[PDB]
């Protein structure tokens, strides 16, 4: 058994810490992001990892950066054998990788070298990958470039969303990390070098990206809708009125991109750059998520065929 420091912020990360608590290792400290300011007022919100640490009596460290000598000294004094890093917002410089005896390992939500970076769950679904998973990697100075210690995969079905894949990777990752730690303490686990030629980058979601580009092929939009469920949710406009798109499936049709080809109980068929997309679940501003069928008997004429979205 080892002295471990855990560093992570969101619910995906907390599931890993929760699993380490039922192991024989000593969690000597829990690093997480400083509490973020809420949208209004002065309250500061605790991260998922922070809340779990408090509930288990663990010491909490919330430095703003690991690139100063004070935080590096405080970490070095913990006399850690290993650092487990899971969706931690902060950059670990070389000096911190050098502090624990076994370095720092990360639980990354993709099958590396695919989807290095910020948003591996959404992009993997968005890109039409057939499978994804979790990679336990030995952290290096580069961005998600380090050697791969252990991988576990899961397929991506035509029905999977970002959230459904998140829930599965949140189950595999914690078990995967515990197993890699055991091999690391036994000295029997060694990392596989990444092929840089096959590496892809899962860039963070930007401002305009969740707005639907109807000139794209319908296949792509159908994946985007799923990938952004439940966050950030795709949207488009109709008569300069916003409209969130929460459910869609492939349909059959051709026309100028964005044109309503048909409106029925089964959904709203919109022409794309290639093919058509049947929208089945929508949300209007200041309203509830509704099947289009519940909107069809109440918004019949508003979605009359021939209008164009955007």
Curated annotation (Swiss-Prot):
Its EC number is 2.1.2.9. GO terms for molecular function: methionyl-tRNA formyltransferase activity. Disulfide bonds: none annotated. InterPro entries: Fmt (IPR005794), Formyl_trans_C (IPR005793), Formyl_trans_C_sf (IPR037022), Formyl_transf_N (IPR002376), Formyl_transf_N_sf (IPR036477), Formyl_transferase-like_C_sf (IPR011034), GART_AS (IPR001555), Met-tRNA-FMT_C (IPR044135). It catalyses: L-methionyl-tRNA(fMet) + (6R)-10-formyltetrahydrofolate = N-formyl-L-methionyl-tRNA(fMet) + (6S)-5,6,7,8-tetrahydrofolate + H(+). Gene3D superfamilies: Formyl transferase, C-terminal domain, Formyl transferase, N-terminal domain. GO terms for cellular component: cytosol. SUPFAM superfamilies: FMT C-terminal domain-like, Formyltransferase. (6S)-5,6,7,8-tetrahydrofolate binds at residues 110-113. One of its GO terms (biological process) is conversion of methionyl-tRNA to N-formyl-methionyl-tRNA. Keywords: Protein biosynthesis, Transferase. Attaches a formyl group to the free amino group of methionyl-tRNA(fMet). The formyl group appears to play a dual role in the initiator identity of N-formylmethionyl-tRNA by promoting its recognition by IF2 and preventing the misappropriation of this tRNA by the elongation apparatus. Belongs to the Fmt family. This is Methionyl-tRNA formyltransferase.
């Amino acid at each position: 058994a080892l002295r471990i420091v855990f560093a992570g912020t969101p619910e995906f990360a907390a599931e890993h810490l929760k699993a380490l608590l039922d192991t024989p290792h000593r969690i000597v400290a829990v690093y997480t992001q400083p509490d973020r300011p809420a949208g209004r007022g002065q309250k500061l919100m605790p991260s998922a990892v922070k809340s779990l640490a408090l509930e288990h009596g663990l010491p909490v460290m919330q430095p703003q950066s690991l690139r100063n000598a004070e935080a590096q000294a405080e970490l070095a004094a913990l006399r850690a054998d290993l650092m487990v890093v899971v969706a931690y917002g902060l950059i670990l410089p070389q000096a911190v990788l050098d502090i624990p005896r076994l370095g720092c390992i990360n639980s990354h939500a993709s099958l590396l070298p695919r989807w290095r970076g910020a948003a591996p769950i959404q992009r993997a679904v968005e890109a039409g990958d057939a499978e994804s998973g979790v990679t336990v990697m030995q952290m290096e100075a580069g961005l998600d470039t380090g050697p791969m210690l252990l991988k576990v995969s899961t397929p991506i079905s035509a029905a999977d969303t970002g959230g459904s894949l998140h829930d599965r990777l949140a189950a595999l990752g914690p078990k995967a990390v515990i197993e890699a730690i055991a091999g690391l303490a036994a000295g029997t686990l060694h990392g596989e070098i990444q092929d840089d030629a096959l590496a892809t980058y899962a860039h963070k979601l930007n401002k305009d990206e969740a707005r639907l580009d109807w000139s794209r092929p319908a296949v792509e939009l159908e994946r985007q809708v799923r990938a952004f469920t439940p966050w950030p949710v795709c949207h488009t406009s109709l008569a300069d009125a916003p409209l969130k798109v929460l459910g869609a499936s492939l349909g059959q049709g051709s026309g100028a991109p964005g044109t309503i080809l048909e409106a029925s109980r089964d959904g709203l068929l919109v022409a794309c750059g290639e093919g058509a997309l049947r929208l089945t679940r929508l949300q209007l501003p200041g309203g509830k998520p509704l099947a289009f069928a519940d909107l069809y008997n109440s918004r019949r004429e508003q979605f009359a065929a021939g209008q164009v979205l955007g």
